[PDB]
Design a protein around this motif. Structure first.
Motif, mmCIF file in Angstrom:
data_model
loop_
_atom_site.group_PDB
_atom_site.id
_atom_site.type_symbol
_atom_site.label_atom_id
_atom_site.label_comp_id
_atom_site.label_asym_id
_atom_site.label_seq_id
_atom_site.Cartn_x
_atom_site.Cartn_y
_atom_site.Cartn_z
ATOM 1 N N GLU A 158 0.970 -1.968 0.200
ATOM 2 C CA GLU A 158 -0.006 0.037 0.104
ATOM 3 C C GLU A 158 0.653 1.584 -0.529
ATOM 4 O OE1 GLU A 158 -2.947 -0.106 3.520
ATOM 5 O OE2 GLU A 158 -4.120 -0.832 1.861
ATOM 6 N N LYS A 159 -0.042 2.351 -0.510
ATOM 7 C CA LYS A 159 1.106 3.797 -0.473
ATOM 8 C C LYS A 159 1.413 4.038 0.627
ATOM 9 C CE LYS A 159 0.410 8.232 -2.485
ATOM 10 N NZ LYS A 159 1.103 8.472 -3.396
ATOM 11 N N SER A 160 0.356 4.390 1.862
ATOM 12 C CA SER A 160 0.355 4.967 2.563
ATOM 13 C C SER A 160 1.573 4.548 3.694
ATOM 14 C CB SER A 160 -0.926 5.037 3.239
ATOM 15 O OG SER A 160 -1.161 3.707 3.275
ATOM 16 N N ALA A 161 1.067 2.960 3.427
ATOM 17 C CA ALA A 161 2.342 2.234 4.394
ATOM 18 C C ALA A 161 3.954 2.124 3.566
ATOM 19 C CB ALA A 161 1.805 0.463 4.162
ATOM 20 N N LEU A 162 4.163 2.140 2.555
ATOM 21 C CA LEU A 162 5.012 2.392 2.313
ATOM 22 C C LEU A 162 5.720 4.189 2.367
ATOM 23 C CD1 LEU A 162 4.896 1.180 -1.913
ATOM 24 C CD2 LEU A 162 6.037 0.219 -0.579
ATOM 25 N N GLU A 163 5.044 4.738 2.714
ATOM 26 C CA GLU A 163 5.111 6.449 3.309
ATOM 27 C C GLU A 163 5.516 6.379 4.471
ATOM 28 O OE1 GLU A 163 3.241 9.955 2.881
ATOM 29 O OE2 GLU A 163 4.458 10.128 4.581
ATOM 30 N N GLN A 164 4.315 5.859 5.197
ATOM 31 C CA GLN A 164 5.121 5.474 6.962
ATOM 32 C C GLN A 164 6.453 5.217 6.808
ATOM 33 O OE1 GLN A 164 1.505 5.361 9.955
ATOM 34 N NE2 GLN A 164 0.568 5.610 6.793
ATOM 35 N N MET A 165 6.334 3.651 6.782
ATOM 36 C CA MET A 165 7.597 2.881 6.496
ATOM 37 C C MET A 165 9.001 3.646 6.549
ATOM 38 S SD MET A 165 7.043 -1.052 5.766
ATOM 39 C CE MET A 165 5.539 -0.678 3.974
ATOM 40 N N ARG A 166 9.024 4.284 5.115
ATOM 41 C CA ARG A 166 9.703 5.683 4.422
ATOM 42 C C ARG A 166 10.144 6.419 6.580
ATOM 43 N NH1 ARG A 166 10.232 3.801 -0.798
ATOM 44 N NH2 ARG A 166 7.899 4.362 -1.827
ATOM 45 N N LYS A 167 9.036 7.141 6.360
ATOM 46 C CA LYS A 167 9.518 7.878 7.796
ATOM 47 C C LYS A 167 9.969 7.302 8.179
ATOM 48 C CE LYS A 167 5.400 10.226 8.477
ATOM 49 N NZ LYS A 167 4.879 11.392 9.176
ATOM 50 N N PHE A 168 9.640 5.721 9.446
ATOM 51 C CA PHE A 168 10.687 5.489 9.834
ATOM 52 C C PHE A 168 11.561 5.593 9.873
ATOM 53 C CE2 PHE A 168 11.023 0.746 11.791
ATOM 54 C CZ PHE A 168 10.745 1.610 13.091
ATOM 55 N N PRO A 196 13.647 11.867 12.537
ATOM 56 C CA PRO A 196 14.104 10.997 13.903
ATOM 57 C C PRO A 196 12.694 11.310 14.580
ATOM 58 C CG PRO A 196 15.491 12.303 12.854
ATOM 59 C CD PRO A 196 15.026 12.355 11.790
ATOM 60 N N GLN A 197 11.622 11.809 14.265
ATOM 61 C CA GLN A 197 10.531 12.017 15.184
ATOM 62 C C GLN A 197 9.523 11.561 14.859
ATOM 63 O OE1 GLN A 197 10.456 15.880 13.916
ATOM 64 N NE2 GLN A 197 9.951 16.481 15.316
ATOM 65 N N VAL A 198 10.026 9.755 13.677
ATOM 66 C CA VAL A 198 8.429 9.014 14.313
ATOM 67 C C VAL A 198 9.633 7.821 14.584
ATOM 68 C CG1 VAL A 198 7.430 7.638 12.616
ATOM 69 C CG2 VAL A 198 7.446 10.197 11.704
ATOM 70 N N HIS A 199 9.261 7.388 16.300
ATOM 71 C CA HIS A 199 9.778 6.324 16.389
ATOM 72 C C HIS A 199 9.168 4.451 16.392
ATOM 73 C CE1 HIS A 199 10.487 10.125 19.537
ATOM 74 N NE2 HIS A 199 10.962 9.743 18.564
ATOM 75 N N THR A 200 7.912 4.345 15.838
ATOM 76 C CA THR A 200 7.965 3.576 15.943
ATOM 77 C C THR A 200 6.446 3.152 14.763
ATOM 78 O OG1 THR A 200 4.946 4.292 16.426
ATOM 79 C CG2 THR A 200 6.774 4.268 18.612
ATOM 80 N N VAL A 201 7.103 1.830 14.264
ATOM 81 C CA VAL A 201 4.942 1.086 13.229
ATOM 82 C C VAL A 201 4.868 -0.034 14.055
ATOM 83 C CG1 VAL A 201 7.353 -0.326 12.027
ATOM 84 C CG2 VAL A 201 5.532 0.401 11.168
ATOM 85 N N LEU A 202 3.462 -0.241 13.496
ATOM 86 C CA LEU A 202 2.574 -0.986 13.576
ATOM 87 C C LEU A 202 2.181 -1.975 12.905
ATOM 88 C CD1 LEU A 202 1.253 -2.415 16.810
ATOM 89 C CD2 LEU A 202 -0.826 -0.699 15.613
#
Ligand SMILES: [Ca+2]
Ligand SMILES: [Ca+2]
Ligand SMILES: [K+]
Ligand SMILES: [Mg+2]
Ligand SMILES: [Mg+2]
Ligand SMILES: [Mg+2]
Ligand SMILES: [Mg+2]
Ligand SMILES: [Mg+2]
Ligand SMILES: [Mg+2]
Ligand SMILES: [Mg+2]
Ligand SMILES: [Mg+2]
Ligand SMILES: [Mg+2]
Ligand SMILES: [Mg+2]
Ligand SMILES: [Mg+2]
Ligand SMILES: [Mg+2]
Ligand SMILES: [Mg+2]
Ligand SMILES: [Mg+2]
Ligand SMILES: [Mg+2]
Ligand SMILES: [Mg+2]
Ligand SMILES: [Mg+2]
Ligand SMILES: [Mg+2]
Ligand SMILES: [Mg+2]
Ligand SMILES: [Mg+2]
Ligand SMILES: [Mg+2]
Ligand SMILES: [Mg+2]
Ligand SMILES: [Mg+2]
Ligand SMILES: [Mg+2]
Ligand SMILES: [Mg+2]
Ligand SMILES: [Mg+2]
Ligand code: NA
Lengths: 157, 162, 160, 158
Positions: free
Chosen positions: D36-46, D50-56
């Motif tokens: 998923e595109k949304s998942a890909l962006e979030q993972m990239r951010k992770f 430095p301000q994204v600490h976590t992924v579920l």
């Protein structure tokens, strides 16, 4: 084919004896005197080469201060002796394998022999046997009976 | 009463183990890892200070991968099929810091051979003559017979699996 | 009624440990030695069968480039240890259900424990708790989480 | 050298099935979630921010149809079993194993009071004590208070 030379046992004892019968440090002159006695050399050669000789004792003795060692095949107690006994695992000691992997070692203190044997039977032989087996039940029971016997002798000094 | 520190036992084992369970050389890394385990430090400390703990086992195990060597230190005396061990038994209830450690312990090695054979050998070649040597110089003759019966019993057990 | 055999746990750890405590690959021999210790078998059997034992720790230690593993019930820090902690979800591990559904897993690194705990509290516990209560003692517990988080932050800062 | 998103995808393909399924290969549902595109962006951010600490990674069942979803946000769901990844450092580096750079915690479908009580009581409290035995006493006491608070919250709905 090749029985280990006496020097292999001598070298091993120079390193082991100071750890077990002394407070560390190098092999004392007294131990070197014992390792070089002609009688000792013949007892050690016999131990290495003869399937009927199973043991050798290194015995450290004190007199009132003066330390002495003696090497002999015979396993025995002395009131002012602390000893290291070596038992061969196989009939002959092979020159081609490490010596430490061919021996069993036991120390024998100056305590009453009833105490020392009680301790070895109760704390080593009994649990080691049980650990394996858990005629076998009859031998477990004989170990227990030997332990009690020795405990009685120890208590009755 | 001062109890010996666990470092006293560690130092001793570093020197002794290579002579008894290896072919000499320096204390192997596998032994040092086993000597630094929190569980082993705890077991060693109980051995030094608790009158009810009589023993400690240094066990060297091999695993087929070529062989991988591992050590483990624990109070329990047991057999392992690819294990060669050194057992220490305390001579007194606590190990005193103010006397040499070697004078307060009894040592026995326990190989990877069949325990019937190992035990037969200790009974036949050490326990029997040590006992007989002493009594020669009323429960006593009955304990001598009991040693002979134990010896024979272990002999038969070994023979039955040969 | 039927407790999972120790071999169920051994098998699960053989697969899981290499992904969480190593860089993939096969179960190292060091792990297999830790898994076959008699002390370890007994600790693992007690974890599987005894309601009063809640946890088991697989601890990876490094000496000097020399890697050792040890398995024990006790959860603790070690200065050159990275660990995987399993906590049971129910009193006894049931042989008739998949083992992974019965355990909670947490990794515990060689970082200062102040930092490790700060991170778990502030990045997992806090937002998980808040997600639930937002969707009479609950606000009091929320406040406790914030105090704990703050306290751990200050403990870490003090040694930096 | 920051880690590429494929490094996290590959790792999840191996880990997820051990922790949220009964082994086996990565299900197609997990693969759909990782693309998923949304998942890909979030993972990239992770990985990079430095301000994204976590992924579920959250596994949901619907009455059973299985769905996965990857997002930064750590939360509970009644029909969800999740794996939370927390970065140890501000960014994930390509030149070190990814597993050495993450902390992992599983979060089940149990009452959150029970799950959190269990983590605090069986992991956090003894871990902290083990260290301060080898302001610290105040924190030890706050751990105990939190433990008790969660215990009572769970008892109250039993
Ligand atoms: Ca002489
Ligand atoms: Ca171990
Ligand atoms: K002589
Ligand atoms: Mg001298
Ligand atoms: Mg004498
Ligand atoms: Mg012979
Ligand atoms: Mg080594
Ligand atoms: Mg340790
Ligand atoms: Mg071996
Ligand atoms: Mg043991
Ligand atoms: Mg001194
Ligand atoms: Mg001794
Ligand atoms: Mg004996
Ligand atoms: Mg027979
Ligand atoms: Mg089973
Ligand atoms: Mg290895
Ligand atoms: Mg517990
Ligand atoms: Mg390390
Ligand atoms: Mg329970
Ligand atoms: Mg249960
Ligand atoms: Mg710290
Ligand atoms: Mg936590
Ligand atoms: Mg892949
Ligand atoms: Mg950051
Ligand atoms: Mg989410
Ligand atoms: Mg607690
Ligand atoms: Mg506390
Ligand atoms: Mg309270
Ligand atoms: Mg309540
Ligand atoms: Na989605």
């Amino acid at each position: 084919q090749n029985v280990a030379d006496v020097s292999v046992l001598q070298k091993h004892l120079r390193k082991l004896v100071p750890l077990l019968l002394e407070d560390g440090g190098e092999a004392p002159a007294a131990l070197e005197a014992a390792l070089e006695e002609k009688s000792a050399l013949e007892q050690m050669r016999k131990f290495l080469s003869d399937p009927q000789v199973h043991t050798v004792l290194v015995e450290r003795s004190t007199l009132k201060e003066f330390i002495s060692y003696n090497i002999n095949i015979d396993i025995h107690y002395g009131v002012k002796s602390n000893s290291l006994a070596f038992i061969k695992r196989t009939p002959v000691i092979d020159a081609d394998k490490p010596v430490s992997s061919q021996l069993r070692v036991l120390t024998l203190s100056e305590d009453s022999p009833y105490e020392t044997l009680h301790s070895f039977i109760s704390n080593a032989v009994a649990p080691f046997f049980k650990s394996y087996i858990r005629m076998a039940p009859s031998v477990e029971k004989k170990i227990a009976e030997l332990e009690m016997g020795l405990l009685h002798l120890q208590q009755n000094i």
